[PDB]
């Protein structure tokens, strides 16, 4: 039997996870203050 679904399942979940992990860290890399800290560093 193919039994491909049994394997893809673990993947179907990883997706939402990879987003939840990047969505929680993005808030810190997209913060407003970042502009003030990037301006003095880029200047």
Curated annotation (Swiss-Prot):
Tissue specificity as recorded in UniProt: Widely expressed (at protein level).
Top-level lineage group? Eukaryota
Instruction: Report the PTM annotation.
Output: Phosphorylated on tyrosine residues in response to EGF and PDGF.
The residues of the intact protein that this chain contains are 715 to 757 of 1134
Taxonomic placement: Eukaryota, Metazoa, Chordata, Craniata, Vertebrata
What would be the name of the gene that encodes this protein?
ANKS1A
The record's subcellular locations are: Cytoplasm; Cell projection
* Origin species: Homo sapiens
Q: What is this protein called?
A: Ankyrin repeat and SAM domain-containing protein 1A
- Describe the function of this protein: Regulator of different signaling pathways. Regulates EPHA8 receptor tyrosine kinase signaling to control cell migration and neurite retraction.
Query: Which proteins does it associate with, and in what oligomeric form?
Result: Interacts (via SAM domain) with EPHA2 (via SAM domain). Interacts with EPHA8; EPHA8 kinase activity-independent but stimulated by EPHA8 ubiquitination. Interacts (via SAM domain) with EPHA6 (via SAM domain).
Where would I find the SAM domain in this sequence? Answer: 1-43
Q: Which ranges does the record mark as transmembrane?
A: none
């Amino acid at each position: 039997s193919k039994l491909l679904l049994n394997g893809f399942d673990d993947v179907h979940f990883l997706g939402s996870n990879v987003m939840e992990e990047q969505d929680l860290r993005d808030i810190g890399i997209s913060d407003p203050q970042h502009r003030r800290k990037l301006l003095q560093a880029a200047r």
